[PDB]
Amino acid sequence: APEPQIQPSFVGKEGGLLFSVSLTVPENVSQVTVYPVYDEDYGLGRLVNTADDSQSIIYQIVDDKGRKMLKDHGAEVTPNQQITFRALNYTSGIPPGIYNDQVMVGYYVEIATKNFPVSTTIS
């Protein structure tokens, strides 16, 4: 399982792109999910500004069709292909900084779960 990469969104809007995670699909993997764990049940995460405790951003992660990703529901994939997931702002309607959070990547081979730190820049 090669490492996913972060693509910053260089946002304060509802449904606004926050960042992207794209990865290469391993051999024998037929489904991939990337999902937040701040509110696992509802597939919501929380970005926190490293330089300011009081600033956060609630987000959901979606596939290419704008569908929400959960632990038990990922996008169908073909081995060796690339897939991109997008974190979208879940807040209603943002000061710059480095925002942190943790997500998971699930590979359906039997499922393999991997922890993936997220660190991204809001301009």
Resolution of the determined structure in angstroms stands at 2.5
Q: Which domains does the chain have, with CATH numbers?
A: 1-123 (2.60.40.3480)
Residue 82 · residue 22 · CB < 8 Å? yes
- What approach was used to elucidate this structure? X-ray
| CA proximity to 5, closest of 18, 17, 23, 19 | 23
Strands (E), 1-123: 5-8, 17-24, 31-36, 44-49, 52-62, 75-76, 82-89, 97-108, 111-122
Q: Return the structure tokens found at 52.
A: 């300011």
What is the rounded radius of gyration, in angstroms, for the C-alpha atoms of the chain?
14
State the Cα–Cα distance between residues 20 and 9, nearest whole angstrom.
8
* Residues after which the chain is discontinuous, using a C–N cutoff of 2.5 Å: 10, 93, 109
